[PDB]
């Protein structure tokens, strides 16, 4: 087949070592390793076959190497194909499929990455203009579908809720030992699952949660992490502010039961909130307290902690093998995205020519894809509005700065079990310390 000259239609320039390179050791379609942006756009809108995986990876990651306005200009340019009888075949097997691929890209862009348009109204103006100029009978159905999407974008049986000492409605008595431990774990799992599910790839690609505009670009991610940090600190606080030893043993024991239920729910964020609290300086040194923890709960906590050993070897295997719903620990994804982006070149060079390194972007898109896969399935659990609100509004730090607060926790640790004879402290809980355990009531 014969195409226009590159001096009229830039996407006609043949492939070469200086244009496109492929992955050499890996659904019938070759894996692009690197290429100029012209070639990447060509293959993104290739006439010989659709390439949904390339489209998804591209639209998830292109902003590191191409700005949204530039991409719109480039796919418009691709669409406007000039002709060089044998034209009938050219129109059938080149113009038509390339233009359909362009509309497919527009459709996926507006559908899954509409945030580009919400942040640049002029981008949306250009897109609606472009779509409006599209006059074709083969195109009409795709054009109408795109317009519809754009218009829309401008706009089983759960178990019984468990109760312990606090009764329904008695918000004022809600606390670590008065709410039922199963229900604490369930409502924290609902909170943390929603927090996990709200995080979008746009907060992650580009490592933007580490940069000076993180608060603007990664608000859901930060809110999620901040909740996790808050719960860890609240667990440590509950422990070291319980100065009576017997009561402290009951507190630590209840927290291990909450951990057990987190494990039952595959809430690994919850597992690690607890594990991080137990590893904290103020808590880890409380030998007189762990002394009285029953050996079964010691084993529960031991298994959970071992999930984090060896750079999370066992956490990773267990996550690979569980079935949803679950709440992954996000920290590992963040490290892998950041180290992938920082540990690989943006550009490869071949024959003095610069080519966008696309494989590093594919690696980042695989990570964000795995996150999304665990955001699909929700938990079959009922919300308890008041328990939910209680955990949303936990604020163990109060007005203190981080250093002041963690120093105060460590000094409480030193006071309740000195480095010095062990003092006695009076009880603070009026109610019974015995746990209802972690099996339901029916």
């Amino acid at each position: 087949m014969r195409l226009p000259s590159a001096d009229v239609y830039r996407f006609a320039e043949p492939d070469s070592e200086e244009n496109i390179i492929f992955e050499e050791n890996m659904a019938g379609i070759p894996i692009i390793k690197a290429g100029t942006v012209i070639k990447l756009i060509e293959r993104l809108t290739y006439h010989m076959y659709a390439d949904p995986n390339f489209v998804r990876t591209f639209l998830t990651t292109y902003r590191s190497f191409c700005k949204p306005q530039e991409l719109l200009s480039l796919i418009i340019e691709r669409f406007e194909i000039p002709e060089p009888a044998e034209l009938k075949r050219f129109r059938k097997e080149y113009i038509q499929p390339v233009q359909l691929r362009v509309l497919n890209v527009c459709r996926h862009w507006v559908e899954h990455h509409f945030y580009d348009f919400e942040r640049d109204a002029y981008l949306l103006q250009r897109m609606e203009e472009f779509i409006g100029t599209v006059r074709g009978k083969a195109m009409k159905k795709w054009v109408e579908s795109i317009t519809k999407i754009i218009q829309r974008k401008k706009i089983s049986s759960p178990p019984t809720v468990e109760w312990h000492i606090s009764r329904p409605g008695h918000i004022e008595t809600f606390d670590l030992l008065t709410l039922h431990p199963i229900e604490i774990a369930r409502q924290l799992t609902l909170l943390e699952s929603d927090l996990y599910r709200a995080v979008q790839p746009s907060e992650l690609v580009g490592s933007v949660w580490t940069k000076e505009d993180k608060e603007i670009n990664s608000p859901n991610l930060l809110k999620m992490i901040r909740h996790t940090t808050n719960l860890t600190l609240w667990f440590e606080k509950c422990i070291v502010e319980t100065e009576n030893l017997e009561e402290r043993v009951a507190v630590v024991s209840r927290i291990i039961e909450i951990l057990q239920v987190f494990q039952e729910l595959n809430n690994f964020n919850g597992v690690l909130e607890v594990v991080s609290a137990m590893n904290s300086s103020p808590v880890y040194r409380l030998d007189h307290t762990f002394e009285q923890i029953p050996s079964r709960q010691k084993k529960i906590l031991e298994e959970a902690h071992e999930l984090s050993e060896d750079h999370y070897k066992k956490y990773l295997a267990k996550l690979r093998s569980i079935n949803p719903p679950c709440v992954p620990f996000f920290g590992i994804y963040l490290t892998n995205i950041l180290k992938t982006e920082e540990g690989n070149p943006e550009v490869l060079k071949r024959h003095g020519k610069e080519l966008i390194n696309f494989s590093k972007r594919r690696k980042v898109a695989e990570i964000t894809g795995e996150i999304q896969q665990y955001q699909n399935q929700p938990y079959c659990l009922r919300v308890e509005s008041d328990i939910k609100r209680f955990f949303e509004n936990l604020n163990p730090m109060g007005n203190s700065m981080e250093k002041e607060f963690t120093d105060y926790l460590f000094n409480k640790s030193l006071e309740i079990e000195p480095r010095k004879p062990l003092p006695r402290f009076p009880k603070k809980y009026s109610y019974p310390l015995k746990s209802p355990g972690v099996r339901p009531s029916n």
């Binding site: 030998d287 050996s295 010691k298």
Partner: peptide
């Protein structure tokens, strides 16, 4: 020995 939640010796 090890962590306070490990088996003593």
């Amino acid at each position: 020995k090890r962590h306070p939640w490990s088996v003593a010796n």
